[PDB]
Ligand binder design. Structure first.
Ligand SMILES: *[C@@H]1O[C@H](CO)[C@@H](O[C@@H]2O[C@H](CO)[C@@H](O[C@@H]3O[C@H](CO)[C@@H](O)[C@H](O)[C@@H]3O)[C@H](O)[C@H]2NC(C)=O)[C@H](O)[C@H]1NC(C)=O
Ligand SMILES: *[C@@H]1O[C@H](CO)[C@@H](O)[C@H](O)[C@H]1NC(C)=O
Ligand SMILES: *[C@H]1O[C@H](CO)[C@@H](O)[C@H](O)[C@H]1NC(C)=O
Lengths: 527, 1239
């Protein structure tokens, strides 16, 4: 390892490592856009039914994550991103929600094993001394992914309900083109990976040292010109946990679970909380009507946000109008006529409806509660942009917090950084309680995010520096699967805990971060 | 097509479809031409002089055969043009018989029936029969033997003798042992029989004379059915002959009718054989098929053929429908054997082909053919490819005029039959006369009918148009055995025809001496020679028979006095009008005395006309018939005797619980089957020995009336000829109009005489035949009940109890109703029977009917009929009664003080029609109120209504109430029990049970045995009582009471009896009134208009929606779609009521403007999309519609199609096309009783 390290040090940093860094940041962008399309696109397409794809990611992170250490890093990444791109393109040309969700699940299977492979790949190419910086830089691509995936989303599909609707025409296919275009970074990465070579350290590990010498010579020449078996893989995974690597992996798993719990809970909690705040503000408004006697009136316009009590609507007529958030209680209709009336959230209660006609309407049976009809009849019957905006802003908030981690991890360390960041984020979380406003929420959101990226970067480096080239991939893979696990958890609890309480989720979050930021310290030093 | 590549006559001798042929024969026969027409069928254009050696000449024999009609010719078929025409005709007949699906199945059955190769003396070998193949000689010089099934050869010496022959064997009787063989059909298509039919006037009262020609397709079909019986080896023994008695003077001298002819005729004739002989034949044929299956199992070798033994075994197992259980062990199953036997016997009949072809044919073989008609079939302008002689779109199609010679005379030419008009004759003397043989009564002998009634029976644990289409659907196709290669046989195929049993020549010229005049003397006394001398009518047969110039008549003395008077030129027109009017007067007379049981129209002048019973007076005949029933009409009384029916023995499984219940159930089932079998035997005996005499009497009346008309117009023309030139030219006259009007009078009289004879036969059956069976049969019931009682107690209890004794006392104390619907088809007979029972039973306790502007009781028992002031009557029909919820909306009926008993109502019934409005007010829930009352002092009965249910309550003095209820829900999409006319009847047997029936369907029974004494009400109350609703009103009509309990049969037909088209509610449909539309096939949708005009169309859309009121009713909306109005087009009735077969126009209201309905029939496709046009439309488009179904007709009378709908792509458009449904529709008049609000 000494001679390989020395020759890699002599190779230095130049054109080749930058080109590889770009063609790998493409895959990290693909991972980011997958996280976005699973956490803010499917849940608004239908609820958290699509989340199951996260579970699929888990399997990928263990199936395509641990396999690479026994088979290869370029081949495994090639296959994984190829299957992701192919099945996403197939998902684009799909009719029905079930087939689309299955295609998304297999795409998640394919992509969930990309992050461990890309990090392990790039870790065997850069100089030992200048290792923390460049790896850290790669992280930003991940975040950029979400930003891009958000920025385009509100431009293409700012209309919820596109998932559970197949009776529409061949138009309204904005979701189809969105799914097509979200597979762009992975497609460009697949185009690019034909030129990049395999991992030199892994290739030397397997054998054929002449090929390793050839790739080392090619890297050196490029830099000079610029400057002028599943049994084996399961036993390998067990060798990463219940063996010499026992305490380190346990601590790393705890830290990864804690961060992927708190972060992936809050990132989805914040847009939900802002929507709930807007909903609470809206509900505060209503016209109460008592003792009406409406005689011979033809209604044509739209009346909204009203309640009627003890009304006596005699010989009325509702034709070609919109009912919006209007309630009827104890109202006595009489020979009224309903024609081409379209209703939303309206509900009739205890009403006596007599001699009416409901022709060409959507006022179904379920809109009537404890109502008595008399001589009546029933004839033939018929943007959440902010969310995306909020998401974008959050993803964007970490960019400044990343550079300040990029050119600093070689000074403070790889253990102090994560510890501090986690603890600092937990403090910010404890200030949330105080905040109660649109500006307040997004401010807190941004703040948290900005201080919640150094940790992730430190985490990535510490988890890729510890294990050797013969357990790295496998190890990274399982920690990524566990990260995907924490994601599901936070994105489920925090999500469900909206409009019932605020302290509980926040306290919970704070606790997790504290816990992780206190256990992170008990880790082998790597400098 | 069945026959492709028409083969002309002068095509070459290629060898596979046209070739020279050697037929099997006893001796030597020269090469003979023929044309293969299909697989395994051949047609030989030559006369049959080769099969039978005795027939070497074509000269008529000196001894004419005992046949009703026959023609002989020796130069027929001689020339080549005749051969070509013969073959064209036979090809056309084959394609026509193949066209109909039933005929298609028959042709397939003929094709598949290859004879069995059982000719090997060694049991384990299969060899072809030497005598069932034909040697085809090729032009090269060599011949090849080929098997086949049918050969068509020109007629024998007797040209019109069409028959079937087979080549027999020395020891094997092929035709009756399951083997079968090739059949040779002596047939010709160029000649047809001519018979006479007098039972068509029911459908076509404008029919003239008879003399109809039988469709040659039917005759070929009869020959084909004979063949089909013979290929499967199921022919009945020819020596089994339906023998007749020939001793008496009135008995027909003799004629052979084998049972195979009775089977092949089918229909009415098939009932001449009892079930016992049929069962014997079925068992024998099943045993023979078991034998052939056993032989096929035994055989493991074949010699003389190329193909595999397995292939021939497959062919034979398909032919005989055998089953092999994967072990090479063939077996036949009783189910498939029964199906095949029924298909060959009961399905393939002449009657079914006649029904499918819609052509005339004699209903019985007794109607002997009376002429020979030369026809021409080759041209299509005479005999259409599809519909026979009845060409569509022409005058011949209507009234079956195609088969009528006197209209379609250019197609049929009469020939002189060579059987003498009086060659076979009998002599009658008292003055001697001669009678032709074929004009006598048919008297079957008693030996032809047998019974196994006396044989006892033991019961063990386990003992026991449309159908043509189901058989066709189940039928198999695409499996026709391919032509097979065989080693060629010798140059000459020796063989003898199947031996026919000898028939001795029946004696001719017998003399009979009698002390009385028979009807033959009277029938001869009305004939004449139409000589030059004047012919005089007379009232004495003794002079008319003796004097050739005097003719007997049975009309009144004034008539003969007039017709014997000379008159002058000015007087003759008055003379002829007087005589035609008077003739109609005698021919139209009917007696009014109807106290006799169901002989309502007694016609007197039948007496002196045919000397029935030896009276010469109309009044004396009427008295004799009234006294003696229908016996006097029959020439000889048919003896009927039912011996004692055998007992029933039950086996006992000691300590059994569920097998014994099965034993009693099987006992009941066999009781029912025994009742059915004895009724069937009685019916077949009646039909054999009663109906034939009545048919002969009807024919004699028809010919008597025709002879009277002949004599009348003969004497009139004699008087006409007396004039000089100036009188005959100045005073015109023609005989055609006189003949037409006299024939029409004959027809109107003949309708009456036909109906009269119908009730005579039916009354005789119901009176003097069924009691003899029923007495022995109820004695059998008594013995069976005794046996079941002995088992139901058996002085022990280790058994399984009151329910069993209740059941046995119930069913074995009552009688099963007797109906011929399950025994006969003759529609005329069917109607008379049922119509009778119901019409007579009408007379009952109270017959409340509103006629003559008053509500009266036609049963002349009701004392007084009170009418309230607040009752209402329907102007369109005065018989409807509307009752309101007011005190004076009341009707009181004063029941006769005679029939009022304390313990009456032991067996009685009520029936009426109710229309109920739709309940609105919620207080009416659980609000019971009596609508009809006959209860006094806490005893009587009452009919009451409550929320959607009808309640019949019986109540005795001792508080024992019995309520039977019929309920229906109001929350249903379509209802048959609201605002509709509902027939309700209640049957009561105070001994056993009370039963309720609605519109003729079973609903509920409850025991009323616990009821004691139920005192009779003084009067009958019609009033709402206790109904809290202030608007409730009823509709009731045709209320009737029955002093005896009724039965399912008499109640169901009653429904139809009391039932002019009706609307949804059952009320009369009316003209110039709007109506909504509803199709029964698709109820949930309504009709809608689109862009009216020629391009416009009607379509089906929806859903119709729903109108409801909570916990009271829910139902789909009814007033949906454009309303339809109906107005007169050519109906002459002043009133706006529609009746059946009324041609009217149909209009529709669209945005309150009226549109014609019409369509263009020239559009492609059978479906004719109708359209809504403006009133100023063009008359070319079909808009006349006949009347619940409606049929659109073209302006020329052609039926465009039944009005319905077709699913034209995604639009359910409306069509007039020529489906088991879609022809059912319904009109919805606007009704105040329903209450749904239109807009
Ligand atoms: C539901 O509709 C039904 C029928 O559509 C209503 O019942 C009807 O009420 C009217 C008004 O009282 C009755 O009219 C009567 O006419 C006679 C004759 O002209 C007049 O003398 C009376 O004074 C009265 O006006 C009508 O007979 C009655 N129909 C029936 C079948 O009862 C009913 O009121 C409506 N509402 C409810 C809650 O049922
Ligand atoms: C509905 O209204 C009726 C009459 O206005 C009243 O009697 C009834 O109690 C009401 N029901 C409820 C629970 O509002
Ligand atoms: C409804 O009708 C009113 C009265 O005729 C008319 O002023 C109004 O413009 C109509 N509604 C709309 C939205 O046009």
């Amino acid at each position: 390892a000494h001679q390989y390290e020395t020759i890699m040090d002599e190779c230095g940093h130049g054109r080749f490592q930058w080109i590889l860094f770009f063609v790998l940041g493409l895959a990290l962008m693909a991972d980011g856009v997958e996280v976005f399309v699973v956490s803010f696109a499917l849940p608004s397409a239908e609820g958290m039914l699509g989340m199951i794809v996260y579970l699929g990611m888990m399997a990928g992170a263990f199936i395509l994550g641990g396999l690479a250490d026994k088979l290869g890093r370029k081949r495994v990444l090639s296959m994984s991103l190829a299957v992701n791109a192919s099945f996403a393109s197939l998902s684009s040309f799909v009719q029905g929600y079930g087939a689309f969700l299955f295609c998304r699940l297999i795409s998640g299977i394919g992509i969930g094993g990309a992050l461990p492979i890309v990090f392990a790949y790039f870790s065997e190419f850069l100089s030992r001394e200048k290792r923390g910086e460049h790896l850290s830089w790669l992280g930003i691509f991940w975040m950029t992914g979400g930003l891009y995936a958000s920025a385009m989303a509100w431009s293409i599909i700012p209309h919820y309900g596109w998932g559970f609707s197949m009776g529409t025409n061949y138009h309204f296919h904005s979701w189809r083109v969105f799914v097509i275009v979200c597979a762009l970074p992975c497609t460009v990465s697949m185009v690019a990976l034909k030129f990049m070579p395999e991992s030199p350290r892994f290739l030397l590990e397997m054998g054929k040292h002449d090929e390793a010498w050839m790739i080392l010579k090619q890297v050196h020449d490029t830099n000079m010109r610029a400057k002028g078996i599943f049994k084996q893989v399961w036993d390998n995974a067990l060798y990463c946990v219940m063996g010499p690597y026992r305490m380190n992996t346990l601590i790393l798993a705890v830290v990864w679970f804690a961060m992927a719990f708190s972060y992936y809970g809050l990132t989805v909690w914040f847009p939900d909380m802002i929507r709930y705040f807007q909903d609470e503000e809206y509900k505060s408004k209503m016209k109460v009507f008592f003792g009406e006697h409406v005689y011979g009136a033809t209604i044509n316009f739209t009346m909204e946000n009203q309640i009627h009590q003890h009304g006596k609507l005699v010989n009325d007529k509702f034709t070609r109008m919109y009912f919006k958030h209007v309630l009827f209680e104890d109202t006595f209709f009489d020979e009224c006529y309903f024609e081409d009336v379209t209703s939303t959230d309206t509900y009739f209660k205890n009403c006596t409806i007599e001699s009416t006609i409901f022709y060409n309407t959507d006022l179904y049976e379920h809109k009537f509660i404890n109502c008595r009809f008399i001589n009546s009849t029933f004839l033939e019957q018929k943007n959440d942009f902010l969310i995306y905006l909020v998401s974008f802003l959050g993803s964007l908030s970490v960019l400044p917090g990343n550079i300040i981690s990029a050119l600093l991890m070689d000074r403070i360390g790889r253990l102090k950084m994560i510890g501090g960041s986690m603890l600092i984020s937990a403090v910010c979380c404890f200030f949330l309680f105080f905040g109660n406003s649109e500006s307040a929420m997004i401010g807190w959101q941004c703040l948290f995010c900005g201080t919640s990226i150094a940790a992730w970067n430190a985490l990535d480096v510490i988890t890729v520096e510890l294990y050797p080239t013969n357990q790295r991939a496998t190890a990274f893979g399982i920690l990524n699967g566990l990260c995907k696990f924490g994601a599901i958890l936070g994105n489920t609890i925090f999500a469900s805990f909206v409009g019932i309480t605020k302290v509980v989720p926040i306290l919970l979050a704070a606790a997790s971060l504290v816990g992780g930021g206190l256990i992170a310290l008990r880790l082998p030093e790597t400098r | 097509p069945f026959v492709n590549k028409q083969f002309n006559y002068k095509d070459p001798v290629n060898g596979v479809d046209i070739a020279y042929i050697k037929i099997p024969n006893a001796g030597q026969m020269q090469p003979v031409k023929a044309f293969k027409i299909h697989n395994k069928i051949w047609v030989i254009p030559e006369r049959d002089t080769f099969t039978n050696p005795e027939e070497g000449d074509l000269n008529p024999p000196p001894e004419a055969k005992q046949v009703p009609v026959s023609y002989y010719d020796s130069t027929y078929l001689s020339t080549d043009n005749e051969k070509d025409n013969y073959l064209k005709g036979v090809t056309k007949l084959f394609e026509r018989i193949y066209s109909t699906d039933l005929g298609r199945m028959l042709l397939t059955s003929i094709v598949r029936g290859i004879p069995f190769w059982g000719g090997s003396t060694i049991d384990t070998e299969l060899k072809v029969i030497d005598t069932n193949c034909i040697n085809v000689i090729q032009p090269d010089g060599s011949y090849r033997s080929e098997e086949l099934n049918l050969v068509i050869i020109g007629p024998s010496a007797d040209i019109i003798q069409f028959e079937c022959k087979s080549f027999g064997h020395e020891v094997l009787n092929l035709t009756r042992n399951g083997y079968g063989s090739t059949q040779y059909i002596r047939f010709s298509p160029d000649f047809t029989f001519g018979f006479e039919e007098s039972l068509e006037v029911d459908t076509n009262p404008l029919l003239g004379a008879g003399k109809f020609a039988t469709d040659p397709a039917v005759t070929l079909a009869h020959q084909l059915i004979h063949a089909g019986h013979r290929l499967y080896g199921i022919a009945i023994n020819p020596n089994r002959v339906f023998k007749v008695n020939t001793n008496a003077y009135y008995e027909m001298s003799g004629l052979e009718v084998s049972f195979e002819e009775l089977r092949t005729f089918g229909g009415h004739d098939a009932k001449f054989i009892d079930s016992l002989q049929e069962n014997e034949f079925r068992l024998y044929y099943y045993n023979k098929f078991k034998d052939i299956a056993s032989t096929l199992n035994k055989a493991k070798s074949i010699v003389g053929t190329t193909a595999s033994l397995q292939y021939m075994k497959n062919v034979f197992k398909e032919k005989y429908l055998l089953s092999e259980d994967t072990s090479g062990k063939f077996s036949v199953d009783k189910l498939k054997f029964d199906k095949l036997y029924k298909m060959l016997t009961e399905i393939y009949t002449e009657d079914n082909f006649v029904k499918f072809f819609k052509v005339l044919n004699a209903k019985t073989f007794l109607n002997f053919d009376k002429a020979v008609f030369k026809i021409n079939i080759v041209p299509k302008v005479n005999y259409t490819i599809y519909d026979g002689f009845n060409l569509r779109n022409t005058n011949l199609a209507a009234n079956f005029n195609g088969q009528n010679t006197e209209i379609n005379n250019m197609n049929f030419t009469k020939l002189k039959n060579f059987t003498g008009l009086f060659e076979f004759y009998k002599l009658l003397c008292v003055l001697c006369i001669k009678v032709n043989n074929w004009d006598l009564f048919f008297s079957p002998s008693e030996d032809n009918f047998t019974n196994d009634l006396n044989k006892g029976e033991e019961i063990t644990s386990d003992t026991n148009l449309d159908l043509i289409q189901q058989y066709y659907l189940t039928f198999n196709f695409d499996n026709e055995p391919e032509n097979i290669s065989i080693e060629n046989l010798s140059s000459d195929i020796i063989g003898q025809l199947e031996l026919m049993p000898n028939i001795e020549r029946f004696p001719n010229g017998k003399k009979y001496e009698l002390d009385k005049y028979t009807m033959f003397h009277y029938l001869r006394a009305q004939e004449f020679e139409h000589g030059k001398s004047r012919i005089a009518l007379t009232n004495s047969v003794n002079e008319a028979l003796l004097n050739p110039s005097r003719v007997y008549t049975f009309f009144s003395s004034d008539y003969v006095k007039k017709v014997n008077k000379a008159t002058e030129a000015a007087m003759f027109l008055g003379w002829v009008e007087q005589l035609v009017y008077d003739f109609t007067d005698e021919t139209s007379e009917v007696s009014t005395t109807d106290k006799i049981a169901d002989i309502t129209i007694i016609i007197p002048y039948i007496g002196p006309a045919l000397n029935i019973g030896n009276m010469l007076y109309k009044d004396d005949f009427v008295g004799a018939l009234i006294f003696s029933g229908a016996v006097i009409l029959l020439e000889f009384i048919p003896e009927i005797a039912i011996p004692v029916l055998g007992t029933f023995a039950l086996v006992s499984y000691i300590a059994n619980k569920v097998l014994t219940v099965q034993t009693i159930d099987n006992a009941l089932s066999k009781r029912n089957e025994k009742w059915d079998e004895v009724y069937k035997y009685i019916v077949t005996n009646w039909l054999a020995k009663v109906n034939t005499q009545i048919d002969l009497i009807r024919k004699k009346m028809k010919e008597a009336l025709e002879n009277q008309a002949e004599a009348t117009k003969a004497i009139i023309n004699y008087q006409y000829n007396q004039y000089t030139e100036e009188e005959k030219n100045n005073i015109n006259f023609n005989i055609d109009d006189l003949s037409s009007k006299l024939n029409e009078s004959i027809n109107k009289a003949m309708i009456n005489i036909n109906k009269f004879l119908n009730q005579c036969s039916v009354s005789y059956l119901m009176n003097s035949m069924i009691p003899y069976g029923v007495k022995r049969l109820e004695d059998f019931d008594a013995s069976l009940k005794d046996a079941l009682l002995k088992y139901i107690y058996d002085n022990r209890g280790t058994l399984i109890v009151d329910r069993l004794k209740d059941k046995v006392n119930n069913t074995l104390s009552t009688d099963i109703p007797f109906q011929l619907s399950k025994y006969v088809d003759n529609q005329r007979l069917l109607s008379t029977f049922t119509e009778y029972i119901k019409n007579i039973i009408n007379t009952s306790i109270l017959n409340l009917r509103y006629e003559s502007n008053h509500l009266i009781d036609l049963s002349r028992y009701a004392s007084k009929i009170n009418i309230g002031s607040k009752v209402n009557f329907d102007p369109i029909d005065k018989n409807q009664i509307q009752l309101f919820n007011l005190e004076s909306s009341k009707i009181e009926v004063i029941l006769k003080n005679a029939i009022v008993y304390n313990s009456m109502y032991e067996n009685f019934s009520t029936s009426f029609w109710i229309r109920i409005p739709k309940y609105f007010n919620s207080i009416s829930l659980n609000n019971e109120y009596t609508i009809i009352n006959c209860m006094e002092n806490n005893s009587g009965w009452k009919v009451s209504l409550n929320y959607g249910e009808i309640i019949w309550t019986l109540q005795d003095t001792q508080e024992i109430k019995q309520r039977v209820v019929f309920k229906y829900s109001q929350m249903i999409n379509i209802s048959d029990y609201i605002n509709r006319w509902i027939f309700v009847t209640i049957t009561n047997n105070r001994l056993n049970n009370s039963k309720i029936y609605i519109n003729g369907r079973l609903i509920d029974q409850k025991p009323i045995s616990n009821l004691g004494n139920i005192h009779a009400s003084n009067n009958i109350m019609f009033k709402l009582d206790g109904c809290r609703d202030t608007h409730r009103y009823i509709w009731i009509k045709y209320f009737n009471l029955f002093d005896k309990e009724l039965n399912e049969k008499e109640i169901k037909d009653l429904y139809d009896n009391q039932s002019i088209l009706k609307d949804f509610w059952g009320d009369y449909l009316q003209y110039d009134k709007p109506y909504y539309m509803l199709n029964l096939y698709d109820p949930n949708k309504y009709v809608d208009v689109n862009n009216v005009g020629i391009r416009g169309y009607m379509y089906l859309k929806g859903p119709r929606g729903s109108v409801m009121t909570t916990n009271i009713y829910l139902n789909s909306s009814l007033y949906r779609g454009a309303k339809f109005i109906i107005k007169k087009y050519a109906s002459g009735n002043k009133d706006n009521i529609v009746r059946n077969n009324d041609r009217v126009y149909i209009n529709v209201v669209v945005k309150n403007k009226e549109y014609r309905l019409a369509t263009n029939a020239s559009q492609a496709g059978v479906e004719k999309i109708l359209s809504a046009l403006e009133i100023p439309d063009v008359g070319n488009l079909s808009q006349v519609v006949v009347m619940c179904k409606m049929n659109l007709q073209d302006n020329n009378g052609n039926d465009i199609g039944f009005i319905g709908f077709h699913q034209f792509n995604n639009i359910a458009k409306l069509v007039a096309s020529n489906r088991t449904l879609g022809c059912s529709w319904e009109f919805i008049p606007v009704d105040d009783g329903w209450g749904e609000r239109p807009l």
